[PDB]
Structure formats: structure tokens, C-alpha cells
Design a protein around this ligand. Structure first.
Ligand SMILES: Cc1cc2c(cc1C)N1[C@H](O)C[C@@H](c3cccc(C(=O)N(C)C)c3)[C@]13C(=O)NC(=O)N=C3N2C[C@H](O)[C@H](O)[C@H](O)COP(=O)(O)OP(=O)(O)OC[C@H]1O[C@@H](n2cnc3c(N)ncnc32)[C@H](O)[C@@H]1O
Lengths: 133, 666
């Protein structure tokens, strides 16, 4: 009911090899052509990816910037408030990014900031201007 | 199996069932109540046992009933019916046994037997055993036909059948007790050696062999599971099915490499797209670092937009620096996977050129066993007789297998050098016309009630006929003759004065350089007391080596032997014999095979006797007059000696039941 292990015999396969006399070598030749094809298409992209791999030497080590460690304050300097409003216009609602800019405010404070000072810094308008880009 | 149940098995009979044949002779019992069948079955099994326990003397009905016990021995007629049935069909009191009850003074009936081959001799003995006048006509100057034995000095070597295939159920087992036969077991260990003379390593020898066996099963799957048995209106041979299997295994190897490297390109390309993302990201990070540097250059104290610009650019640069780092995890994973695949490539080939040659030897062995190129064997039917295989070791005959026919011929009327040439059978009897083989002038005529024809199938196949049937054989018989296969297989006997081979190996192979010559001298046998090696020529090679002089052949033989053992080690042989069975006119081949487009039903066709038309029209339908036996006539055991022998015993019973009557059917 099942062919012996390691033997591949499907109904579909057998006509394909017995359609004519040379249908055997014809089918094998195409597979030989299919392999050589894929084989050099590998070394093509192996060399394409070899060049791309070189352009990335040095990585980005020179462009890295030291980690700034700030304990996380709670009062809003007038300075820190102004940083925020500009961050909203540049960054929309990406609170993590907005907190990153201010550096000393955790994300939750920023959302709260969006309400407490929502009237006075006229936020609502700012977000629409950020929506325009 | 032991006991009375062993007797039935050793007689090729189920112990607990009545056979089709016993049904015909005992139709009362088989339609009868089940208890009587058990009675009968025991009486048969027991009687076989008695005969089997000692087959050197005749088993008389009287002797039988004595060793039988109640309640089995209550019904004498049942016992007499059973004993007489078994005696008639050669299941007891066959072969070479001493006569309790000596022959009747006057014989009844006259029968001519063509052929002194084992089929012939076995029927002849049986008929004479039954009180008939038997004469055998033989074209050769010796008996045994295709059981030939070369004998010179103390050298001895069969050029014909040389193997007994296991004594479990084999009638030759009985003949062995009857005739002393040096029966020597065949050690199955066979080392192969290539064209170079160096042995195959156990790694290959077992890898290739196991592939061979796997390849065979593959064809059985094609045959029985996929009905691959016709192709362009023509029946499929084993050879074709083997190629198709091999091609499909070579195909699957390529299919496997294609999807392997297509796994690589799927990954190289995932990498390509990943590096392009990384260049472009690095070039943006190059640009923001400059921008953040410039913004940091404006010395403070600055206004808050300029302070926002420094902080905003710094946030952005560390967000792009984060991306580029995650992408370099993802290139690390993908770089590792590419090395892994590049390290687990699938199998390069299906079989190497050396590997294909060892495979050829295993095919040559198969071409030897069936005495024919695999391209001719029917795929569906070639192994139809595998089901009735005997049990036990295969054996060889140390003292020459001719001892058996010669022993059977004792007591028989045999005309040697008598070439039958026309067979005339009519409603009133038959006439056989033969000539003398030495001077073909001197013509003989034999008249008898019936003719048993054990002419080899190669002879029956011959066009134009070496034997004319008058009237001609009906189409249903001649068509069976064309459809069937008569193969070929030749031997070369090498007689030396030194043993220079491994004496502990009975048989060792030689691997051929090409598929075409795979059977040319591909195997050697160490079987005799004297230093004699015996070399096969099977397959397509068999029929071709018959057009090449002995010397050339014995040359190629020595050369192969020199490669295995070194030029110094093997000397020139004292005596050399080469067979040519296809050339032999009383054989025209070696033995039969199940040709593509034939079937096992043809073997039954061959055995049906011929009944001629009535002489005076309107006269009653007559008796059958022409009977056939021989290895080509016995469906379940073709192409063997024991099969010949059984067919002899068969017709003898059939002829007897026709000319002497069977009183055991009441
Ligand atoms: C030629 C040859 C025959 C055989 C063998 C070898 C050779 C060379 N050996 C080989 O290793 C193969 C083998 C075997 C072993 C295991 C299994 C199988 C098997 O399963 N397979 C399917 C592969 C095969 C074996 C062997 O070891 N043991 C073995 O078991 N079997 C082997 N075999 C077969 C037997 O050899 C053969 O089958 C019997 O001998 C049958 O004898 P036959 O009696 O029916 O046929 P004859 O030819 O013997 O009788 C004819 C008489 O008619 C005379 N004749 C002709 N024309 C005229 C005329 N015009 N007028 C007057 N007389 C005439 C002729 O002159 C002779 O007098």
C-alpha cells in the first residue's frame, strides 16, 4: 500500500517519464538546467550581498551617542513645558518619543500634561497642525 | 512441520484441507459430512508418512492398513481408495524402490515417450510401474537431457542443473534417500570483486545489495499498486519497470537539490533586502549625526527652539541607532541559517558509476536465476512461483547430478541416438517416426496407444520445425508455445591441479565493466572435491558468448581469475569445457521463463493433452492420444528438475487413468 522507504513513486510522476521514449532524459535535463540556473543565481546575490556587506564597515560605532541617565523628576520647569509643546508639534502623539526628548518626564506624566495644560498651551490646535503634515 | 502433518507438507499438500484433485476422485467425501473429511485427510497424511518414513521399499495397501489404527482402519475401501489414489499420482511408490509385488507377466497398453529427460524417465518408470509397455526415444547418446554431468578422470562437473533448492517439500528429497547423492550445502556468502580485482568493501556491498532489493519491491509496487502493466499497447517487462524506478529515484534526487538551493536563494534574497535597509539606514544616521553635531556646536545659552533641536535630533539619532541594531540581530540569525544550509546539502547523486556497476552484478544474478534478460520477464507474473518455494538450504550435487537420471533409467527400454521427427496421432492410435542420429538414413516407426512428449520448449518453438505434428497442433497449443519464454544460460568448467581460491567460499562474483556485459562470467562456483571452478554466462551475454571459441572464453576466464588472485597464483587449466545450450539442437535454450505478455496460464495450456478428431465422421468422440510433460508444463514449479520430475509423475497418472481406468473414483 506504501512504497518502500527511500523510494519515490507517484502516479503523476510515472506518465511524465514514460510519455515517450526520451521523456526520461528530457525530464532529467530540465532539472539539470533548473539547478545550474538557481546555482549561479545564488552566486550572483552572494556577490551583490558581498558589496552591501562592505559598505556597512565600521557599523555605526562613530555615530553612536552616549546614554544619558536621568532620574525622573515630577515638576514642570517652564523650560520643560516649552520643550514639550514643540515636541508635540514635531512628534504628534508618540509619547515615548516625546518623553525621550524632555528626558526628565516619564510617559505617564506627558499624557497628564496633555490634559492639565491642554487649554493654556492650546494643544488641540497644535495637533491639527501636526496632522497637516 | 513434524508428524502426519509434516508428511502432507513434505508432499506439497495442505494437511487439513482436501485439494482440488482429491475432490475429483472423492466427490462423495468432499460433499460429505465434515467428520469423514477428517477421516480421509488423516488416512492420506498417515499413508504419506509411511511412504515418506522409508521410501526405499514399496508401500503396499496391505502394509498400509496394518500400521493404520481404529477407527481409521475400520473402513477398508476408504483406505484402499486413498492408497490407490496416492499410488497412481506418484505421491507414494515413485522414484527408485524395491518391489514387494513383482511386475505382472503381461503388460497392457503401449506408450511411446519422446525424450529421456527427467520428465521422461519419471513418467516411464511410473507407467512401467503400473504395468504398461513403455519405450523412450532419445536423440542424444545419453539420458538426463538438461541434467548433464561432465566426467573425466576424477574431475566431475554438471553443465546442466546443479542446484537442489531446499528439501522442504522437495520430491528430490525422496530421491536423495533412494539414490546416494553427495548433497552439499551452499554457503550463501559471496564476495564481489571488480574489474580491477579488488574486493568491494562491506560498506558498498551491503548498501548496493539493499538498494537492489529496494528496487525490486519498487517494481512490485508499480505492478500491484499502480497497475503499471501496459505501455503503448505492449506489456511491461521487469527491465522497463526497473529503469522507470531508477529514473524516478534519480529524478527525486534532483528535485531534492532544487528545493534545497531554492531555500538558500529565498534566504540570500531576504538578506539582500535586509542589507539594503541597513545601508539606507546607516546613511540617514550619518546625516543626523552631522545635524546633531552642528546643532550642538551652537554654544549655549540658547533659546528653547535651538535647545529643542539638539534634543529632538538626539532622540531621533538614538531611535535610528536602535533600528540598525535590531536589524543586525536579524542579519545574524540569517547569516547563521545560510551557513547551516550550506552545510547540510542533500545527496549529490542517486548512484555512482562504481555503484551502478555493483548493481549490475545483482541484476546479472537475477538474469541468471531466470535465464533471461530482465527486459523479457513479465513484470506482473515473473515471480508467480515464489509462493510455492521450498524450505531449507540450497544444495549442490558433489558426485554429479547425472547420477539421478542414470539411476532412473535402470530397467527401462531406452533407444538412444533416435531422433523423433514426426508424430502421427489418430482416433485409433499413434505412429512416431524417428531416424538414427548417426546415419540419418535408417528410419524407424513406432506404433502405440499414446505418445508422451517431453520435447524441450525450445525444440517445440523451432521454426522451421524439427518435429512435425500430424495433424498439426491446434492454435491454442501453438500460441502457448510462442508466448512462453525459453531462456538461456551457459557454464564454463575450469579444471586445475591446484586449489588457489578461498576453499571456504563456495561462490564469488566478478563485476562487469558495462551494463551490456553484466552477465559475462560474472560468477564462479567452488563446488567439487577436485580443484574445479565453474563460471556462469548469464543474461544478454549468454547468447553472445556462444559465437566465441572456447580458448577466447577460457582466456577471459583466466584474466578475471588473475585479477582476483595475481598472475602467479593461477596456472593454465588442465581441462576446459564450455556449454552452448542455445546452440544444442535437443535443447535450443536452458529453461523456461515467464515472458512479458505470457502468464502462468500458458503453463497449463502446455499440459493439456491433445485428442484427435474421429476417423469415420459421426463416430463417437475419442480418447486423448498426445500427452505433454517437462519443466515447461508444470505451472507451480517451472524451469527446475523437481518440476520436470513432478510433471512426469503427473502425466503417468493421467495416462494410466485413461488406459487402465481408475476404480478408486467410486
Ligand atoms: C539447461 C540448464 C537447466 C537448469 C540449470 C542449468 C542449466 C544450464 N540449472 C541452473 O542451475 C539453473 C537452475 C535453477 C535453480 C534454481 C531455481 C531455478 C528456477 O526456478 N528458476 C525459474 C530460475 C533454476 C537449474 C538448477 O541448477 N537446478 C534446477 O533445478 N534446474 C535447473 N535447470 C533446469 C533443469 O535442467 C531442467 O528444467 C530439467 O532438466 C528439465 O528436464 P526435461 O526433461 O523437462 O527436459 P530435458 O531437456 O531434460 O529432456 C528433453 C529430452 O528430450 C530429448 N530430445 C529433444 N529433442 C528430441 C527429439 N527430437 N527426439 C528425441 N529426443 C529428443 C533431449 O535430448 C532430452 O533427452
Amino acid at each position: 500500500r506504501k512504497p518502500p522507504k527511500g523510494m519515490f513513486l507517484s502516479q503523476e510522476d510515472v506518465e511524465a517519464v514514460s510519455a515517450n521514449a526520451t521523456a526520461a532524459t528530457t525530464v532529467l535535463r530540465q532539472l539539470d538546467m533548473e539547478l545550474v540556473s538557481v546555482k549561479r543565481q545564488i552566486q550572483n546575490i552572494k556577490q551583490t550581498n558581498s558589496a552591501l556587506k562592505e559598505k556597512l564597515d565600521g557599523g555605526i560605532e562613530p555615530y553612536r551617542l552616549p546614554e544619558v541617565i536621568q532620574k525622573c523628576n515630577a515638576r514642570w520647569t517652564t523650560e520643560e513645558q516649552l520643550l514639550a509643546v514643540q515636541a508635540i508639534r514635531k512628534y504628534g502623539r508618540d509619547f515615548q518619543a516625546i518623553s525621550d526628548v524632555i528626558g526628565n518626564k516619564s510617559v505617564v506624566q506627558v499624557k497628564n500634561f496633555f490634559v492639565n495644560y491642554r487649554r493654556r498651551f492650546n494643544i488641540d490646535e497644535v495637533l491639527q497642525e501636526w496632522e497637516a503634515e | 512441520p513434524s508428524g502426519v502433518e509434516g508428511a502432507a507438507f513434505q508432499s506439497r499438500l495442505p494437511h487439513d484441507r482436501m485439494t482440488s484433485q482429491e475432490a475429483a476422485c472423492f466427490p462423495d467425501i468432499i460433499s460429505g459430512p465434515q467428520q469423514t473429511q477428517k477421516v480421509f485427510l488423516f488416512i492420506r497424511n498417515r499413508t504419506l508418512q509411511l511412504w515418506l518414513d522409508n521410501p526405499k521399499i514399496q508401500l503396499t495397501f496391505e502394509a498400509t492398513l496394518q500400521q493404520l489404527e481404529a477407527p481409521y482402519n475400520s473402513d477398508t475401501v476408504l483406505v484402499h481408495r486413498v492408497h490407490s489414489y496416492l499410488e497412481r499420482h506418484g505421491l507414494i511408490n515413485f522414484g527408485i524402490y524395491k518391489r514387494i509385488k513383482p511386475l505382472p507377466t503381461k503388460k497392457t497398453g503401449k506408450v511411446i515417450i519422446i525424450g529421456s529427460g527427467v520428465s521422461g524417465l519419471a513418467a516411464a518408470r511410473q507407467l512401467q510401474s503400473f504395468g504398461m509397455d513403455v519405450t523412450l526415444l532419445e536423440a542424444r547418446d545419453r539420458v538426463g537431457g538438461r541434467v548433464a554431468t561432465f566426467r573425466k578422470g576424477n574431475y566431475v562437473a554438471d553443465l546442466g542443473a546443479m542446484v537442489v533448492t531446499g528439501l522442504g517439500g522437495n520430491p528430490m528429497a525422496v530421491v536423495s534417500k533412494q539414490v546416494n547423492m553427495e548433497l552439499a550445502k551452499i554457503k550463501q556468502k559471496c564476495p564481489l570483486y571488480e574489474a580491477n580485482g579488488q574486493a568491494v568493501p562491506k560498506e558498498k556491498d551491503e548498501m548496493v545489495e539493499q538498494e537492489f532489493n529496494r528496487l525490486l519491491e519498487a517494481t512490485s509496487y508499480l505492478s500491484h499498486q499502480l497497475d503499471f502493466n501496459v505501455l503503448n499497447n505492449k506489456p511491461v517487462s521487469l527491465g522497463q519497470a526497473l529503469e522507470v524506478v531508477i529514473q524516478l529515484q534519480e529524478k527525486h534526487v534532483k528535485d531534492e537539490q532544487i528545493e534545497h538551493w531554492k531555500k538558500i536563494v529565498k534566504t540570500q534574497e531576504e538578506l539582500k533586502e535586509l542589507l539594503n535597509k541597513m545601508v539606507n539606514l546607516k546613511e540617514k544616521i550619518k546625516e543626523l549625526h552631522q545635524q546633531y553635531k552642528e546643532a550642538s556646536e551652537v554654544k549655549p545659552p540658547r533659546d528653547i527652539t535651538a535647545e529643542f533641536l539638539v534634543k529632538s535630533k538626539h532622540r531621533d539619532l538614538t531611535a535610528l541607532c536602535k533600528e540598525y541594531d535590531e536589524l543586525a540581530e536579524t542579519q545574524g540569525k540569517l547569516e547563521e541559517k545560510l551557513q547551516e544550509l550550506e552545510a547540510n546539502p542533500p545527496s549529490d547523486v542517486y548512484l555512482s558509476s562504481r555503484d551502478r556497476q555493483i548493481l549490475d552484478w545483482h541484476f546479472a544474478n537475477l538474469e541468471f536465476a531466470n535465464a533471461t534478460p530482465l527486459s523479457t520477464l513479465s513484470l506482473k507474473h515473473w515471480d508467480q512461483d515464489d509462493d510455492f518455494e521450498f524450505t531449507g538450504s540450497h544444495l549442490t550435487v558433489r558426485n554429479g547430478y547425472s547420477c539421478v537420471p542414470v539411476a532412473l533409467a535402470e530397467g527401462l527400454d531406452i533407444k538412444l541416438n533416435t531422433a523423433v521427427r514426426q508424430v502421427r496421432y489418430t482416433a485409433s492410435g499413434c505412429e512416431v517416426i524417428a531416424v538414427n542420429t548417426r546415419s540419418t538414413s535408417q528410419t524407424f516407426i513406432y506404433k502405440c496407444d499414446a505418445v508422451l512428449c517431453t520435447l524441450p520448449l525450445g525444440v517445440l518453438k523451432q521454426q522451421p520445425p524439427a518435429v512435425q505434428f500430424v495433424p498439426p497442433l491446434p492454435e491454442w497449443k501453438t500460441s502457448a508455445v510462442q508466448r512462453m519464454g525459453f531462456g538461456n544460460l551457459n557454464k564454463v568448467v575450469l579444471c586445475f591441479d591446484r586449489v588457489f581460491w578461498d576453499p571456504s567460499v563456495n561462490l564469488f562474483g566478478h563485476v562487469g565493466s558495462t551494463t551490456a556485459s553484466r552477465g559475462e562470467l560474472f560468477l564462479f562456483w567452488n563446488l567439487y572435491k577436485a580443484p574445479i571452478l565453474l563460471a556462469l554466462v548469464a543474461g544478454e551475454a549468454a547468447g553472445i558468448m556462444e559465437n566465441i571459441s572456447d580458448d577466447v572464453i577460457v582466456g577471459r576466464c583466466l584474466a578475471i581469475l588473475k585479477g582476483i588472485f595475481g598472475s602467479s597464483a593461477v596456472p593454465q587449466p588442465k581441462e576446459t569445457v564450455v556449454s552452448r545450450w542455445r546452440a544444442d539442437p535437443w535443447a535450443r535454450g536452458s529453461y523456461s521463463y515467464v515472458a512479458a505478455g505470457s502468464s502462468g496460464n500458458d503453463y497449463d495450456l502446455m499440459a493439456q493433452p491433445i485428442t484427435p478428431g474421429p476417423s469415420i465422421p459421426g463416430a463417437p468422440q475419442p480418447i486423448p492420444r498426445l500427452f505433454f510433460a517437462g519443466e515447461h508444463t508444470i505451472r507451480n514449479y517451472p524451469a527446475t528438475v523437481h518440476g520436470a520430475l513432478l510433471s512426469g509423475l503427473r502425466e503417468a497418472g493421467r495416462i494410466a487413468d485413461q488406459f487402465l481406468g481408475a476404480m478408486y473414483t467410486l
